[PDB]
Design a binder for this molecule. Structure first.
Ligand SMILES: *[C@@H]1O[C@H](CO)[C@@H](O[C@@H]2O[C@H](CO)[C@@H](O)[C@H](O)[C@H]2NC(C)=O)[C@H](O)[C@H]1NC(C)=O
Ligand SMILES: O=[N+]([O-])c1ccc(O[C@@H]2O[C@@H](CO)[C@H](O)[C@H]2O)cc1
Ligand SMILES: O=[N+]([O-])c1ccc(O[C@@H]2O[C@@H](CO)[C@H](O)[C@H]2O)cc1
Ligand SMILES: O=[N+]([O-])c1ccc(O[C@@H]2O[C@@H](CO)[C@H](O)[C@H]2O)cc1
Ligand SMILES: *[C@@H]1O[C@H](CO)[C@@H](O)[C@H](O)[C@H]1NC(C)=O
Length: 481
């Protein structure tokens, strides 16, 4: 029995079932998600390897070889047609074409499920998915449940990393017009104990950590790499439950009446589905989604408990973010350009500007140090790396407005995330490509001999698809200094 079989047995069946990692019904053998690759802009689907099984990650790796991939569609396994696609503009514009939100990388969230590789949905600020034409989802004050398995360590405080029920117009239509899982450390509305992040419920114009606006002591900080968030709502009742998705049981952090503020009882749900964004298209949040569902009816605690036991049995474990030659902490390197016409250039810097320059044995010692990089444990991810200046110790290559700058580590989460890069076997086969940990659609990329965190196509000039594979491939050489 998969999660949706368990919900059905509790007479609260799934009406939307979304996962890039696995089938959520024991008999589902259809497509889990759609990929689009940058090389030819064509698509393919990824299905489970067996009915009721795990995503064919090998088929993704094959399709995405020597290029970049985006997850274009997360299919609804339930048969209701509630597929998640690129989220449209609403109250807020996204940063993509026509104010759409960005699609996620296919490769930002590698995992294993019982030892088998799969890929989650790693969502950087400005990423979002939606279905405003959803069928079967609860509306008005009708009962529903939902859950998601999320990365409890990938979050921020911006509005809003949500999964669940939202407005069909992509605008704020008032209190009670949403009911979605939220994960992050926003303290604009609700928050819990400790420093966050918190699972809360987005009910529109409020993230609730419980019955009260603001602080609720019973909502703990999440301390799990894989978190099961289970949320449910019915007629003047709702709940927040949380578990380590890798071990043990759901605990209940809120259960009872709707918050006693105008507009939350009865609810006015609209039945649209969102992922990674707020109901009005607020698109500042980040997070990672692995699997989740929405149901018809208010699930029992027992049904949710059987779902959690199923999740634990799936055995989520962190996967490898790194491929290709890679690095050791304390190694000093120079990174040589491989693009035809520029192959004598190395990644260097002039003060804060990271650039490419011709560097050779006759260059000034000043330039040799500027073309030399101390590789250290990733500031935001210990599998990945950060690139420390030899001439300016304590300063690292970071992205800022998607340009690579050499800036001093200020100890902030923002800097750490901006300064962390995951080596990948070079897209042209010549050395390494350095993928942004925080924006895995983007890579170290030279454009007019300046370094950017560029995507393979996009809204910035330096996201040009011309020479992309070459422009993101660098040979790892002995440091000049
Ligand atoms: C969410 O958690 C982050 C990470 O701890 C908090 O980050 C701090 O932001 C302040 C300014 O608001 C900086 O001066 C600190 O250096 C930050 N700390 C780190 C470690 O980056 C953030 O404040 C939290 N957000 C809210 C709303 O509480
Ligand atoms: O007035 N504002 O500054 C403002 C901006 C965004 C905003 O977002 C709404 O409130 C969030 C919390 O419920 C929901 O996800 C979103 O639709 C709610 C209020
Ligand atoms: O132009 N701005 O007002 C502006 C706002 C935010 C901003 O964020 C920076 O740009 C992001 C992308 O490189 C990094 O994650 C962050 O440090 C960079 C620039
Ligand atoms: O308008 N231009 O002057 C101009 C010239 C070259 C050019 O190519 C880019 O710059 C080259 C070197 O960084 C990269 O290989 C390529 O993406 C991009 C723009
Ligand atoms: C594709 O990338 C792999 C890994 O770097 C490499 O071995 C292979 O040579 C590349 N092929 C092409 C056509 O670039």
């Amino acid at each position: 029995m998969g999660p949706c079989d368990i919900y059905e047995a509790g007479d609260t069946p799934c009406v939307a079932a979304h996962s890039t990692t696995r089938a959520l019904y024991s008999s589902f053998s259809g497509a889990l998600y759609q990929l689009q690759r940058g090389s030819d802009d064509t698509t393919t689907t990824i299905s489970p390897l067996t009915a009721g099984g795990i995503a064919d990650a090998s088929a993704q790796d094959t399709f995405c070889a020597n290029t970049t991939c985006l997850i274009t569609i997360i299919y609804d396994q339930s048969g209701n047609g509630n597929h998640l696609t690129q989220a449209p503009p609403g109250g807020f514009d996204g940063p993509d074409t026509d104010g759409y939100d960005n699609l996620a990388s296919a490769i930002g969230a590698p995992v294993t499920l019982n030892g088998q590789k799969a890929y989650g949905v790693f969502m950087s600020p400005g990423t979002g998915y939606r279905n405003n034409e959803a069928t079967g989802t609860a509306t008005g004050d009708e009962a529903e449940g939902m859950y998601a398995v999320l990365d409890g360590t990938h979050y921020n405080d911006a509005c809003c990393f949500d999964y669940g029920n939202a407005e069909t117009s992509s605008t704020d239509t008032g209190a009670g017009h949403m009911e979605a899982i939220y994960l992050g450390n926003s303290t604009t509305w609700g928050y819990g104990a400790g420093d966050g992040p918190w699972i809360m419920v987005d009910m529109q114009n409020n993230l609730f950590s419980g019955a009260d606006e603001g602080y609720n002591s019973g909502d703990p900080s999440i301390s799990y790499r894989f978190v099961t968030a289970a949320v449910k709502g019915g007629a003047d009742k709702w709940a927040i439950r949380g578990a380590n998705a890798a071990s043990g049981s759901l605990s209940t952090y809120y259960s009872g009446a709707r918050p006693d503020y105008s507009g939350y009882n009865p609810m006015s749900k609209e039945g649209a589905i969102i992922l990674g964004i707020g109901g009005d298209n607020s698109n500042g949040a980040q997070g990672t989604f692995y699997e989740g569902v929405m149901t018809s009816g208010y699930p029992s605690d027992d049904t949710e408990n059987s779902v959690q036991e199923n999740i634990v049995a799936a055995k989520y474990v962190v996967g490898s973010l790194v491929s290709g030659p890679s690095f050791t902490s304390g190694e000093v390197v120079s990174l040589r350009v491989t693009t035809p016409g520029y192959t004598t250039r190395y990644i260097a810097h002039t003060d804060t500007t990271v650039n490419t320059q011709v560097v050779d044995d006759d260059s000034s010692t000043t330039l040799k140090e500027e073309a030399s990089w101390t590789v250290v444990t990733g500031l935001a991810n210990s599998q990945c790396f950060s690139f420390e200046s030899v001439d300016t110790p304590g300063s690292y290559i970071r992205h800022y407005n998607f340009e690579l700058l050499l800036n001093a580590n200020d100890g902030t989460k923002q800097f750490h995330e901006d300064a962390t890069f995951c080596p990948q076997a070079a897209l042209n086969g010549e050395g390494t490509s350095l993928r942004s940990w925080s924006y895995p659609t983007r890579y170290f990329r030279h454009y007019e001999n300046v370094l950017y965190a560029a995507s393979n196509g996009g809204v910035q000039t330096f996201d040009s698809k011309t020479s992309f594979n070459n422009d993101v491939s660098f040979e790892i050489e002995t440091a000049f200094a």
